[PDB]
Design a protein around this ligand. Structure first.
Ligand SMILES: NCCCNc1cc(NCc2cccnc2)c(C(N)=O)cc1[N+](=O)[O-]
Length: 294
């Protein structure tokens, strides 16, 4: 690199390969993401550039947008671990409730900030939630979905995870709202509590039906306009809704109440990040130190 020295490969993001790199001049350690095809839209670079101003303690800082050699690299602040790996490492005993609550609270603050600035994530998942030794958790990749349009695939035939997709997206809605992020975060909250993905679909229809089997097949009563959605089919099976007490045991009523509001079918009824922060579930929130092995 002209100013970077690759330390190692962090992985292969939905946009391209990601490396942990050191700025040879500043000595700064960062995450360098090479963006995937043949042209590089000028509209995309302007949009991404705007995100460099989106700074919040719970949002992974976009340090630079490098457009050279007709190639696009995104330089992000570096964090040592993602929530997916932390959840796997905490599988035996589970993440303690105080830490789950702290993380959810911080993620909601991050979403509230992004949403107030009209920036949506659209693809929240445990792998894009990064944590450090101080007890902080940050959202990574906000705004990239809109700026880079349709995701499709990473760049090396890697299957996209649908587990956190809101139902309006699965039903073919063309216009995303802030509510899609609240849905994803609700799914993540449930997974941290139970230690199992809430809706682990292996196809778009399996994803939709797993949601329906748990929350009940939506109808015009709970979701006005659902039967007119692009991919809605009158032939969808009609499943009865299950009780939250069975879905995320042994979470308490404050937690179940909040989760239920984050999982409302109607995006318009789904709780906002701002309103969620005021939920009684957070009355006793604190900021614990996680047991992180690096
Ligand atoms: N398959 C998805 C993996 C998540 N990928 C990422 C992980 C990160 N840090 C956590 C980490 C660091 C080193 C080893 N394992 C995890 C960072 C970052 N900003 O630091 C960026 C990305 N990313 O660009 O996607």
């Amino acid at each position: 690199m002209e100013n970077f020295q690759k330390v190692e490969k962090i992985g292969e993001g939905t946009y391209g390969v990601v490396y942990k790199a050191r700025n040879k001049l500043t000595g700064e350690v960062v995450a360098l993401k090479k963006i995937r095809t043949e042209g590089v839209p000028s509209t995309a670079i302007r949009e991404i550039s705007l995100l460099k101003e989106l700074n919040h303690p719970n949002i992974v800082k976009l340090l630079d947008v490098i457009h050279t050699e007709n190639k696009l690299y995104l330089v992000f602040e570096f964090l040592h671990q993602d929530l997916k790996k932390f959840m796997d490492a905490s599988a035996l005993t589970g993440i303690p409730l105080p830490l789950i609550k702290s993380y959810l609270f911080q993620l909601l603050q991050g979403l509230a900030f992004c949403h107030s600035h009209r920036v949506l994530h659209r693809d929240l998942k445990p792998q894009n939630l990064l944590i450090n030794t101080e007890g902080a958790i940050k959202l990574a990749d906000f705004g990239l979905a809109r700026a880079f349009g349709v995701p499709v695939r990473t760049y090396t035939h890697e299957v996209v995870t649908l587990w956190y997709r809101a139902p309006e997206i699965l039903l073919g809605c063309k216009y995303y709202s802030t509510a899609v992020d609240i849905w994803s975060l609700g799914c993540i909250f449930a997974e941290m509590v139970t230690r199992r993905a809430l809706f682990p679909g292996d196809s778009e229809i399996d994803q939709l039906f797993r949601i329906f089997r748990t929350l009940g097949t939506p109808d015009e009563v709970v979701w006005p306009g659902v039967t007119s959605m692009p991919d809605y089919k009158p032939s969808f099976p009609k499943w009865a809704r299950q009780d939250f007490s069975k879905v995320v045991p042994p979470l308490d009523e404050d937690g179940r109440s909040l989760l239920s509001q984050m999982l409302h079918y109607d995006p318009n009824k789904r709780i906002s990040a701002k309103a969620a922060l005021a939920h009684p579930f957070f009355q006793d929130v604190t900021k614990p130190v996680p047991h992180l092995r690096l």
